[PDB]
């Protein structure tokens with residue numbers, strides 16, 4: 001399953017205290033952009049009503065039967081295309097979220113999760129944003145690998 005529309009809405013449910021709000025907004029907006037730049041998908045932030053993709057920062061158990069696990073391990077997770085909890089992207093508030101390096105990078109994590117929120121699975125390329133392991137890469141030279149692009153275009157392009 002994939003989203004059956006190309007106008008897809010998202011909402012930040014709550015903000016991490018780790019970063020300035022302005023920076024959270026910008027990392028999340030840019031991570032949608034990465035995906036809208038190589039597909040016919042249009043992402044729109046809304047500030048009221050029910051969004052397709054709910055962006056949540058939470059720790060431990062948070063109401064969806066996938067409790068987080070403290071610092072380290074699981075950084076985040078996201079549900080595939082679907083109503084209700086589907087698409088929603090959650091970020092483990094026990095991580096330390098940063099604009100750049102020196103904790104866990106929100107932007108990079110967000111691009112990956114948004115990938116799952118759109119229906120992507122994982123990539124065997126360590127250059128892929130959908131690679132299953134987090135590592136800091138240079139955001140300045142960040143670009144989707146060809147594996148990411150073909151995956152997402154097989155879904156939406």
Ligand SMILES: CC(=O)N[C@@H]1[C@@H](O)[C@H](O)[C@@H](CO)O[C@H]1NC(=S)NCCN([C@H](C(=O)O)C(C)C)S(=O)(=O)c1ccc(-c2ccccc2)cc1
Nearest residue numbers: 073074075076077078108109112121122129131132133134
């Ligand atoms: C064969 C197998 O079962 N592998 C499964 C995949 O089938 C499946 O896509 C996924 C389902 O949970 O999990 C694979 N295995 C592992 S180890 N997944 C990583 C666990 N994280 C998940 C995730 O992938 O989003 C999340 C679903 C809990 S994670 O928290 O460790 C995580 C890992 C890497 C990143 C990341 C961040 C930035 C860039 C690249 C990756 C973010 C989160």
Ligand SMILES: [Ca+2]
Nearest residue numbers: 070071072074
């Ligand atoms: Ca964790």
Ligand SMILES: [Ca+2]
Nearest residue numbers: 052084086087
């Ligand atoms: Ca949803």
Ligand SMILES: [Ca+2]
Nearest residue numbers: 093094095096
């Ligand atoms: Ca935190």
Ligand SMILES: [Zn+2]
Nearest residue numbers: 062064066090
């Ligand atoms: Zn969750």
Ligand SMILES: [Zn+2]
Nearest residue numbers: 112116122132
């Ligand atoms: Zn993943």
